[PDB]
Design a protein around this ligand. Structure first.
Ligand code: GLA
Ligand code: GLA
Ligand code: GLA
Ligand code: NA
Ligand code: NA
Ligand code: NA
Ligand code: NA
Ligand code: NA
Ligand code: NA
Ligand code: NA
Ligand code: NA
Ligand code: NA
Ligand code: NA
Ligand code: NA
Ligand code: NA
Ligand code: NA
Ligand code: NA
Ligand code: NA
Ligand code: NA
Ligand code: NA
Ligand code: NA
Ligand code: NA
Ligand code: NA
Ligand code: NA
Ligand code: NA
Ligand code: NA
Ligand code: NA
Ligand code: NA
Ligand code: NA
Ligand code: NA
Ligand code: NA
Ligand code: NA
Ligand code: NA
Ligand code: NA
Ligand code: NA
Ligand code: NA
Ligand code: NA
Ligand code: NA
Ligand code: NA
Ligand code: NA
Ligand code: NA
Ligand code: NA
Ligand code: NA
Ligand code: NA
Ligand code: NA
Ligand code: NA
Ligand code: NA
Ligand code: NA
Ligand code: NA
Ligand code: NA
Ligand code: NA
Ligand code: NA
Ligand code: NA
Ligand code: NA
Ligand code: NA
Ligand code: NA
Ligand code: NA
Ligand code: NA
Ligand code: NA
Ligand code: NA
Ligand code: NA
Ligand code: NA
Ligand code: NA
Ligand code: NA
Ligand code: NA
Ligand code: NA
Ligand code: NA
Lengths: 719, 719, 360
């Protein structure tokens, strides 16, 4: 629900269990009053006013020294109001002045959920959602700012976006534009962020917010491996199952900044949106710019509920693929199996092997195009290497279909190698600075996807390939960060180009299962999930490390989105050995699939594949649609444990991987969550029965281990 | 010492106990090798190289994927090298391209210590110091960067500054310029910063550095009350008396940014310098810009030694005033005593009162000029209000001198009220944006001190006032933050104007004791200390709160710099009552002085003033020149305790203020520091003798308290 | 240098359910006398050691059938059993003398270089308030008598591993079996903890087989060697089952241990990491003159795209220059203590390293 009280100038947003409230003050500033547990109260009483030294006053406050935007909580604070905190908006006007001082002009409440020009965004119908659009303006900056709030009641989600219009005659530049700001007048908080590196993404870092700013971001042209565009502000003491916590998730696959600051008056400001760095976005007279969306949510009941709200929102209101609600073929991918050393016959052999085991699809990964026999050539030359494939792609696809298997293929359309026909013809299509030799990364360069002619060339090549036969699946990868950034519009316009190509591709090929990739999880974000219902979670396929990566990814993203494959050992990234069974349990917390040559496996491991596939298919709906619960913290605990529970709470699958081993082992219990306390549950394999209450308070004892890194799955059914 | 090894291209800086080492690599990049305990080793072995996903390579690295400025430690990292971390330099060139990719050109080693154009900086002689100047350049940006390193051996200090030259034909803008970068390839650290508000500055915040950035800064046009331009990076576990710690202190009174970041490879980067916000500094062809100086230091032996190194450096190599090495008159200030409600006769009465007590000087604070009978008019009208003073300033000064007292006066030259003759004549002299009504703070505006004509007008007025008689002391205040910033050069040029005026003033009046002020400690920085040997530490004169403010200020700044006065109770800022004796003990940790009307005091409190002054004068040299030790943490402990120890360790003064009170009190011991273990010390008042070892390990028991907030001073003399 | 015949040689001890108290050689099992066995081992150039557990009795023993009242028990109460055995009442001289005499007969059969004296359960059924203390007086009396009669014996104390790892025992035995856990990774924690009070030289530590018999974990032969050299060193496996490459590793391990034995046993010990929290278990021994050091490291954690891990040394002379042996690189003490040395990148789990430094 969205309500306006014209007398108090208060806007109230209600979801099923939360309330967000704002107010236009007597000077026209849009103040933030409240976000938290549902309330019908007017929360304007929380605002207080004192003469605070060096916190100065709008001219319009006259002699009232107690009124300062350096103290007051705001929906969209800006540089140019006298506020000295981190701010959401900076405009440099047609005369060179960095100032924006925004006052209320108008509003509208609409049924349904706004969409964003050229960008992914949460979607819903007119019954499920309402939109509030508030217009603010600065007559001196000659800017008009449209704040968009989307309210999805059942999901306990509030979205925010911004449109900025130049209302003057001269060009302005947008120098900083956040999507969302939460201003807290009170509270002690921790900041949870998800950091990492290539092949080890999304480690949880949780620290108290001390005085000053905790900040993180990306200027890589991508959402990045290093810091995901996501933040949780947890009240001190909040756990998985209790206490207040607030999320912000950026629906965007490019650059971002997140800032959390505890100020001089013990107030907290949280910002998420575009990066200020390499962002100086020109806006001509009468033109509008759109800031990408942030999804906000609140839980009074701990982190697990917060995550569940995000999982539901992403599956049902971000991902557009039919595969959200359909079985997804179990695939085998050629990359760790063969790298570049394959032929068409190799690929068909992989199909034959995989068909005998119950695998549904073979994905031919990198190495099929140009003269791509290593990673030093041929990006941009999306012509099939028929010498290597021993014939045409059409014929290969048919040979694979004759084995009863679907076919998938890898592409990397944003990129170019110097050693390519495309680069010899069009070296100026690479992103570069004139006269400067560019950074190389994996011995490749980015194509300038801000340019239509560049995108069209590559799009046409990709269409020729995909039109050769029935291709069920595409893995779209992106293997380096952006450098040599030549202008202040490029980071943003590049990503608009990517999304345009991706929308064109999905529209032309609407039955395709698109898996996003960027050296693993380098663009693991809700912007990508709007197009691809799964993303390759990491190039690290070590089961033990995957427990941490998958744990971290689960704070915002649903299991169904996490690409996860059983790979060979010793693992190719870590050198560690794990049992086949543990690799299976871990990879079932995601898309499942295989990425190895099964011909090298023992008969016993081949039979394990058969049984794994039967297990995954049996529990696929539960894993993908069920309510997810983290049952341990793999950074600190003896085990990595998680579970999925059906909507009706009548079925659950519990997964456990042991992380530590010593002699004379203590008994380890796994405590379950999300069950009905008074219901009785049957554990399948053992045939023992337990109450929900028992399973949640005492849990179940794990069988004693006899080897390292053992794993378990337990299935419970309500009697 | 400063050494160059041409074969390894290594520069080594040695102080008495520390070594800082850097190297020019085979591609021309200036890498940081080491900073820590003294060593003659070549520390290049600490550099390591791996193919790290998405950490890309200079073109000049060819096919070597293991070489990346996104991983390697650097002296002066920049935007435009492929490094994605926080960076030190961003240049936007004559074509609009944000890029700087700096390669080594040349160096020079010089005896002595460099100076900075228009700016305060550490100074020393040719025997005490050496300078290394390294020239780097980017031929595409057409920028030349001069890195300055100053080495003060005995002080264990290394200073850093930067000069940036435009070597092209078109204008460039400097968008970010740090002064110092420390890159650590290893280590777990905490970040100590000093945060606060008006009337409660420089609280210590110490937190672990988690993944991501801890940042703080000022865009107030001032160093600020909110975050001091100072940072300590302490290795985890470092205490007052053990462990590694690193300082950076900005010798600058304007805007700044500090960033500490723990990266994807568990490396740490620490930056300090100018703020990127409101900083877009134009540089014409052939012009040079100077970044203000940072003072670095390292201690292997804890935080107390680090602070002592800063105290010594600031007293002996920053402050230029003769009063560093001379008795400073004990003053009484009219502000809390009378506010605006005084006459010339009031002031003379205050002189008579104060003379009878042993006070040396009366300071006539705000209210003497224009029609300044409140804080709503007259800034800019620096004409004596002879009606209020009952005659001329010359006559007033003589009447005060006839009471045996020196005379001081308050000024606020950077500011203007709308209600002033100056503003009615020159409204365009205020900092403002054309067409926009400005922020007001204390109902005043800033004068545009970037403009010579504005500065000259005010300078001339101030000279007329100071030329009326023998004025021993000036308090130069500044009572609001900068807003309405109209261009990207203003923040920096404003401060150049302030320093120009301040240098002119100090040169014209070289015997003046200048006390800096900005609503208390709003510009409590080493830039100001170059001109003023003391700064009013806070408008909070509550003894209990002053224990925290003075504690925090001591991490970088010497006791001698901290303006501190005994004021009346109930305290005017907090309403709290404290004993006269406790106010005295607390205010003796600084300049000492009084700020009350002694005519309102009891005879017993007047006698306390007499004895306090005798005590302060007896211990003045020890307090101001002695080695300072924090003996407790007033945020956590039962007491606020500190001590000063003579150079020869033959004399010490220990001060204690109790902070907590309960019944049936436990015995509290104060443990001393900085004494000779085997020496025997006599405690004066008691006549008991103790070894240094005893005093440092067991300490001394405090006499039991009978009232709240009791204070103690103990004097020790070596036998 | 030596073979130790551990439990199983006496009475009819073919499992742990009989024969404690019956310290007569099982000549059927040994295929002849103990004297002959000792000689056959000496003929292979090897010293001989033997295990005893003199404080204990099984119900299934000749001693217990003759003297059931010699077990610690409460009259009328059936006693606690632990490893299916009971304690002998070592507060009683007659009990101690019986067993002492039996042990002497065994040790007098030949040149026995070494005895491992074990003790495999806790005391229960405590019948009076003097017993706990007087029992231990009895143990020490027997132990003093034994050491006085056999003054050239190397006595290793044991109690299911480190169940009596204390300075009282170290007065008699210069080493004690540190733990029955011979898993190298767990041993890094056990040895770390033991080092807070007890010298490396006291910690019995052996290279054992994998999968480890206590944890099921696999570790490389090299990592087991590095870990077991932080103590007495030794082996506890059948080398006939090993590959030729692992047999050659044994040869080289022994050469390494003997080369550094004095340094490890007499040198100043430094913990360089905390294995409960850190990426590595690292330690070093430094000579008295600070002219020689051996640094040992075992990695505990593994992830992809590994960060560089440095080991920071301690206990060196800051201004001295040290040569690292295998690499031939030279460093100041100050450098080694402040920056440390970067570890070579790992390619497998639980890798270990030894670095030797010599002052130039
Ligand atoms: O070069 C192909 C390779 O590229 C990236 O690393 C992907 O994340 C891998 O899964 C594989 O597709
Ligand atoms: O207005 C005068 C007043 O101004 C600031 O607050 C100063 O810090 C005070 O000490 C006093 O000088
Ligand atoms: O039974 C023999 C067995 O007894 C205890 O467990 C010891 O600690 C072992 O080393 C071994 O001697
Ligand atoms: Na307020
Ligand atoms: Na303000
Ligand atoms: Na202001
Ligand atoms: Na504030
Ligand atoms: Na606020
Ligand atoms: Na706002
Ligand atoms: Na604002
Ligand atoms: Na910008
Ligand atoms: Na807000
Ligand atoms: Na990855
Ligand atoms: Na991440
Ligand atoms: Na912070
Ligand atoms: Na970045
Ligand atoms: Na990033
Ligand atoms: Na990420
Ligand atoms: Na703060
Ligand atoms: Na707060
Ligand atoms: Na932000
Ligand atoms: Na990237
Ligand atoms: Na974009
Ligand atoms: Na992706
Ligand atoms: Na990705
Ligand atoms: Na990402
Ligand atoms: Na996202
Ligand atoms: Na599973
Ligand atoms: Na997996
Ligand atoms: Na979990
Ligand atoms: Na590197
Ligand atoms: Na790079
Ligand atoms: Na790059
Ligand atoms: Na990095
Ligand atoms: Na680095
Ligand atoms: Na550099
Ligand atoms: Na750099
Ligand atoms: Na800037
Ligand atoms: Na550095
Ligand atoms: Na103040
Ligand atoms: Na401060
Ligand atoms: Na951080
Ligand atoms: Na600021
Ligand atoms: Na500030
Ligand atoms: Na400050
Ligand atoms: Na990080
Ligand atoms: Na670090
Ligand atoms: Na900085
Ligand atoms: Na200020
Ligand atoms: Na300046
Ligand atoms: Na000042
Ligand atoms: Na100040
Ligand atoms: Na300051
Ligand atoms: Na300073
Ligand atoms: Na004092
Ligand atoms: Na004081
Ligand atoms: Na103190
Ligand atoms: Na025991
Ligand atoms: Na005893
Ligand atoms: Na023992
Ligand atoms: Na023992
Ligand atoms: Na013990
Ligand atoms: Na002991
Ligand atoms: Na044991
Ligand atoms: Na070793
Ligand atoms: Na061992
Ligand atoms: Na250790």
């Amino acid at each position: 629900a969205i309500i306006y009280n014209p007398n108090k100038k208060i806007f109230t947003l209600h979801t099923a269990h939360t309330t967000y409230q704002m107010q236009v003050d007597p000077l026209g500033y849009l103040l933030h009053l409240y976000y938290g547990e549902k309330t019908n109260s007017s929360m304007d009483y929380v605002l207080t006013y004192a003469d605070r030294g060096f916190s100065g006053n709008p001219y319009a406050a006259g002699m009232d020294r107690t009124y300062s935007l350096d103290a007051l909580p705001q929906e969209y604070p800006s540089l140019g109001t006298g506020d000295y905190r981190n701010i959401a908006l900076n405009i440099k006007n047609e005369k060179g002045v960095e100032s924006a001082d925004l006052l209320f002009k108008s509003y509208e409440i609409r049924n349904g959920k706004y969409r964003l020009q050229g960008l992914p965004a949460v979607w819903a119908d007119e019954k499920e959602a309402q939109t509030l659009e508030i217009v603010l303006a600065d007559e001196n900056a000659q800017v008009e700012v449209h704040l968009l709030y989307g309210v999805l009641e059942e999901n306990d989600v509030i979205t925010r976006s911004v449109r900025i219009k130049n209302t003057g005659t001269g060009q302005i530049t947008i120098e900083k534009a956040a999507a969302a700001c939460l201003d807290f007048v009170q509270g002690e908080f921790d900041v949870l962020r998800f950091y990492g590196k290539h092949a080890m993404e999304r480690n949880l870092e949780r620290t108290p917010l001390g005085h000053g700013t905790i900040a993180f971001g990306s200027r890589r042209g991508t959402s990045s491996h290093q810091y995901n565009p996501a933040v949780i502000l947890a009240e001190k003491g909040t756990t998985e199952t209790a206490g207040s916590c607030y999320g912000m998730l950026f629906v965007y696959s490019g650059n971002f900044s997140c800032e959390a600051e505890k100020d001089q008056f013990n107030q907290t400001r949280l910002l998420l949106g575009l990066n200020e760095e390499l962002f100086s976005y020109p806006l001509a007279s009468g033109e509008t710019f759109t800031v990408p969306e942030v999804i906000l949510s609140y839980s009074a009941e701990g982190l697990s509920a917060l995550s569940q709200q995000y999982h539901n929102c992403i599956r049902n209101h971000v991902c557009r693929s039919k595969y959200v609600h359909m079985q997804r073929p179990v695939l085998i991918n050629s990359w760790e199996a063969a790298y570049f050393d394959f032929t068409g016959d190799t690929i068909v052999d992989l199909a034959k092997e995989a068909a005998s085991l119950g695998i549904d699809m073979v994905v031919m990964d990198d190495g099929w195009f140009g003269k791509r026999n290593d990673d030093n050539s041929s990006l941009g030359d999306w012509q099939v290497n028929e010498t290597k494939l021993g014939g045409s792609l059409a014929e290969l696809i048919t040979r694979v279909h004759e084995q009863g298997m679907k076919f998938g293929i890898w592409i990397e359309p944003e990129m170019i190698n110097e050693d390519s026909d495309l680069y010899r013809a069009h070296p100026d299509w690479a992103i570069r600075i004139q006269g400067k030799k560019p950074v190389r990364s994996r011995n490749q360069l980015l194509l300038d996807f801000s340019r239509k002619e560049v995108r069209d060339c590559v799009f046409d090549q990709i269409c020729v390939v995909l039109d050769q036969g029935k291709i069920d699946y595409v893995k779209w990868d992106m293997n380096r960060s952006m450098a040599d950034v030549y202008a202040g519009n490029l980071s943003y316009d590049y990503v608009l180009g990517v999304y345009d190509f991706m929308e064109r591709l999905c529209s032309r090929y609407p039955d395709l299962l698109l898996e996003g990739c960027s050296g693993g999880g380098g663009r693991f974000d809700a912007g990508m999930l709007y197009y691809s219902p799964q993303i390759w979670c990491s190039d690290n396929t070590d089961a033990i490390n995957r427990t941490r990566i998958q744990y971290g990814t689960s704070f915002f993203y649903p299991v169904s989105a996490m690409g996860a494959h059983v790979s060979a050992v010793p693992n190719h990234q870590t050198g560690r050995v794990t049992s086949f069974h543990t690799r299976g349990v871990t990879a079932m917390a995601g898309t499942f699939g295989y990425e190895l040559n099964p011909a090298l496996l023992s008969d016993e491991e081949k039979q394990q594949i058969r049984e794994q596939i039967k297990t995954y298919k049996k529990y696929e709906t539960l894993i993908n649609e069920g309510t997810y619960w983290r049952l341990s913290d793999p950074f600190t605990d003896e085990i990595a444990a998680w579970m999925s529970v059906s909507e009706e709470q009548d079925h659950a699958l519990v997964s456990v991987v042991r992380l530590m081993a010593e002699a004379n082992q203590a008994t380890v219990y796994v405590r379950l969550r999300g069950l009905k306390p008074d219901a009785v549950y049957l554990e399948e394999q053992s045939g023992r029965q337990y109450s929900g209450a028992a399973l949640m308070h005492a849990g179940i004892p794990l069988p004693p281990f006899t080897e390292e890194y053992e794993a378990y799955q337990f299935a419970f059914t309500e009697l």
